């Protein structure tokens, strides 16, 4: 059943059919199988050598794009006091979230790109430090605490004048793949969080401005992008239709009016015999 | 030929004379954990016939205004028979499942049920930011009911639910649905009391209807664990 | 060419053209023949 | 050293670039791979699975009622039962389907589509319908005599519960575009209409109104190009808990 | 030898005893769509003789102050004979064209007509920013007239129009022009009612003149579609 | 007829001619063919080994130049509010337009270079984002809308201090070549736009300043250049003579006075026997 | 790492540079190529096609009247009929031709040119003309006795309607330049003049004034160098709709 | 050498010296001989 | 219909072939000119120019 597919399938010419006991256009949806009726069996076709490629839909390409996963603005001045901590998650920005949620399980390495911008409340070319604090490790409490010495944690130092910082985080789940969805509880007691697999816990990204404060204040914004690569995906799923409500669950409400309202996903038309964008000549 | 079927496991057997072939989730079949994928090092117990057999749950009634039903696995069976006992006495479990949904009526009745096995069906709550609680999820043998089947109670859609292993029970055509489920998880084994690999959903997309004598039309679910393995023996968390 | 020592640092792998739609489109135990009545 | 010079593009961050980058955790050993059922390697595999069309997208139809089309015993002949807008870019019955949702992450498409309808009336109900696909150019047909001139399949209800109407790829250009102008020559696919070929006929004890469920899927001669962000999801505020991730 | 010519297609034939060889646009010849360039998968209809034949349009009069004439293809033939019927009943069409322009006078008359086949002749409007409308472009069998032939009604020039497939009818030399046009488009087939692959332009660069008896001097156009193919059958957009 | 030509053709010496039935200098323009009279047949020639190259006129080189296709200035300040959207087209700047219009059809990939400049109303080294929004996709409504998260759209982030940003857009027409000219209408109804092939619709280029506004305002100008490559061209055409009037059509008016007036393309001389720059000795 | 150093030129944007650059759409599959009539690979192919010279570029001649030269029955002998400025850089009869337009996108040129004239009088009209090409150095000839000393072709009207005058490449230097100084030794090509060899003679019923159409084209020994922007097009304002592209 | 994975990203291709002017200069069905009367 | 466009010139004559186009093998010289087994059709001549 498995095979290498590089282009869309060709079409073979077909002739008239009038065979007893043969009804290719009839099917039984109840079996759970999709119709296997071929164009050649439904109508008379010509031969077509199809050269259309299928590489742009490879999962690696579909998910292989750097998408915004974190955006944080804070004030850089004499006092988030010149630094912040972000509990890593891929559920805050809807474009990336919806795409990842088209799958049940995903295994991939993640390229992380960090873009920094500044505005005066000229622009100083500041040095920032982004430290990866794994689960169970202590997070910094001040712009200058000892934690920043980063003896074991991985830290990256970059300047606002340099290109965005970049590094790859390996597939680090304690399982063979990340659980995009998790129908279970994170603990042995009954009060644990539902829908959050502990196994997919990355940790915290701690970012600070290394420079001591200047005589005036600035607004610094840090944007983090993630691009999955070396991807393997399993069990595709129904796409999200209702607007997202929380980063911690799949709770839903729906838009106030169609489209995508809980009562009607598709916008209404006058009747089942009404053609919306009918060509009038 | 593909309309009649007999399933036999352990001391249990089921026959149907109105089947529609049967589904093997993702084209797979259950199997025991091989040495090259194993993690837990203690010798597992493989009870075979005492656990790999059909367990029939309490039936539900298909009514004119029903929204649908669901049962999570292994939760629905965690307290039934020897499968339930092994689950309670062991920290780890692994198994596939043979699902058989039953529903008959008359040649004068109409109705269509979507019978789908959803992996990791993480439920969402309606119109609130508070996540579903333990009792909203763990219903046990009784199973639960859909609040908004149209979006599968998770903000997506039943329209696209066919992407999951499934069959239909269209009264005019068949009276049963059969789905074989292999172990589905990112780990070789799991703790059975806090995570459900699969969710069996039965939803009436086309409501039950007729103009002949009204009768209670039940829907019954029979599930047989397959290739059960248990590790991490201790006392029962009964 | 990946100049880093860890293979996971390499660029993307866009060369896996293998497919098996049937695991989603025809997960039925008995193969359905072209024009033969499915039931 | 080696004499070099920087080219335009140097220092930029292109979200679709493809390069290796520094490993954060040197000598890290990822968890061994394990076989998992249902691996998908090309999104085209997903859109070949048929899903339900929301044909009854009308006021008064709530939730699942929108996913089925009710047909009744007719008093007149050759009656039009329903039509289906083939709009994928514009909202319509095909938008929230596997093929529709995935295709909307792209801009160009090519290939045949297949619509399968399952009759869900009682066993004692009989009937014949005609499903027609009308290539673009004119107004949607409103009479069977006109629709019948296009691509079609006459469906007889029986043991085999479902029928398939193939919407063959008939286009001048190699691809069509998901353009916001539904009447554009590079986007309009034509129409699909359904008429009674004979009539729905049922006995006294069978319900006299029966439902059809329509499904659609792409065939393996399908192809999608030019990835874009989908118009089906968006946000105007922080999601609940997003900011708390920083506390 | 290259002054006499007979063209025969279907049930039609034309002879000229004063030709000037004949032009094969870009050195090509019409042909049916090969399988390796095809896109539409339905079996096409190839009517042959019912459509691949000469259709003669209404003549026009060459006057002392004429500016020139034009006919767009396939528009000019979209409502003529079986070619017209196939065009109306099918979403897609494909074909080449054999063009024969006719104009005779006496050995005492002088005049020169540029007979050129322009691919994608997108017209421009004069002294306004508003684009030409549907009725300014689609003239059908009657064809249109040039407003400013000097710039080909498109802001360019007739002086350089010779870069396109063409011939001339110089009264003193010949009385007909013949041009064979292959399918010219970026797609293998097209919708015939909203796009014209070619535009036949006939422009008097040297005005008609004489001192002998005045007579009406007509210019006649005969066009034969070649290797016609149609796809996407449905009802007529008559 | 087709052959490889790397240099201009050589000339061969020729002798006196006095042959009956042979008249190489006579031709018949009516056939539509260009004169085939060779220099050797018109006059007595010497032998010349011509080494002149013909590579600078290769279509790839003729069109292979980065030309300005878009120029947009906007105010960067506290409020085009810090961003703009440009419906892509190659008809706004006449030098590039006239050259592309020398052909009927063109197939090519396009190298895009983006140059940014700033002026105070010192200069801040701002970060900009140029997002390619394909047909049918949603365009940003604010400098900060969710659209900029660019989960699938290709986006490029660049600084004013870096060299101009650059990337290649592939030949993306739904046909085998772009239609430089289109004698048809874009829709099935009769009110559609004339002369605009839908098939050649690229989309929108959305550009924003990523930085939040500063205490003072600046004028930012973005210039986009396009250079076609891997070019194939078909059916050359008469060059444009009348000044362009609109980007949506070939409408014409002509200059007020020659040259290039609707009534006279070439400037006048006193008479057909008047030599304009006659050498007076 | 590799020791390197940046050279002058680093970071610049040269519009004529030639380098590869990041693909915006990875894994994009361009539409398959299809054969299309009329492919052109070198611009020299285009300039070898003859096009009409605007010889009658005089006040009083409007539009197409400027593209033909009228000759009449003469009363005197050896009469001068017309001359043609061989200016390509400066405006003149040769500027708006295929060879003229394309050459003006360059600065240097070399090769032979060919002028073909088609007599468009009536069949009963006869005549002999002499077309002369005078290499540079002096003043344009005004008498046949002088013009006749240069390169020429005596043309007899008849069945074959057209005659070709070859303007052979006669230059001291390998190339000539399209210099703004028309009298420069590196630019002036000389002159072309036309005189009656005998006379235009026609019967009473044939028109007594006949037209000639002159064409020009480059031969295959032609070559162009040093690309530059053409002086034939320009703009001082935004074109209509240009700004609207941003709205 | 193109280091990108997509071939369309490569530098220009200035090596196609093939020509066929005759498709524009002599598109006549019957070849015209050197000095022989064209008509 | 079936036709020939005739250009006057050196060759003084033109031929229009009236091909045998009939459903039946033969036609009859029947007194009813409008009979389906007798009517041959028509021949018409117009100015082309
Ligand atoms: C920014 C670091 C990302 C690390 C990988 C996170 C994978 C999350 C998968 C999911 O559950 O949707
Ligand atoms: C700046 C993006 C350019 C994409 C390619 C546009 C081709 C236009 C061809 C034309 O119709 O003249």
Curated annotation (Swiss-Prot), chains D, G:
Origin species: Human enterovirus D68
Residue positions binding N-acetylneuraminate: 91, 95, 231-233
Known role: Forms an icosahedral capsid of pseudo T=3 symmetry with capsid proteins VP2 and VP3. The capsid is 300 Angstroms in diameter, composed of 60 copies of each capsid protein and enclosing the viral positive strand RNA genome. Capsid protein VP3, together with VP1, interacts with host cell sialic acids to provide virion attachment to target host cells. In addition, inhibits the phosphorylation and nuclear translocation of host IRF7 and thereby suppresses downstream interferon production.
Listed name of the protein: Capsid protein VP3
Compartments, as annotated in UniProt: Virion; Host cytoplasm
Top-level taxon in the UniProt lineage: Viruses
Assembly: Interacts with capsid protein VP0 and capsid protein VP1 to form heterotrimeric protomers. Five protomers subsequently associate to form pentamers which serve as building blocks for the capsid. Interacts with capsid protein VP4 in the mature capsid. Interacts with protein 2C; this interaction may be important for virion morphogenesis. Interacts with host IRF7.
Curated annotation (Swiss-Prot), chain I:
Cell compartments where the protein resides: Virion; Host cytoplasm
Superkingdom: Viruses
Function, in words: Forms an icosahedral capsid of pseudo T=3 symmetry with capsid proteins VP2 and VP3. The capsid is 300 Angstroms in diameter, composed of 60 copies of each capsid protein and enclosing the viral positive strand RNA genome. Capsid protein VP3, together with VP1, interacts with host cell sialic acids to provide virion attachment to target host cells. In addition, inhibits the phosphorylation and nuclear translocation of host IRF7 and thereby suppresses downstream interferon production.
Assembly behavior: Interacts with capsid protein VP0 and capsid protein VP1 to form heterotrimeric protomers. Five protomers subsequently associate to form pentamers which serve as building blocks for the capsid. Interacts with capsid protein VP4 in the mature capsid. Interacts with protein 2C; this interaction may be important for virion morphogenesis. Interacts with host IRF7.
UniProt name for this protein: Capsid protein VP3
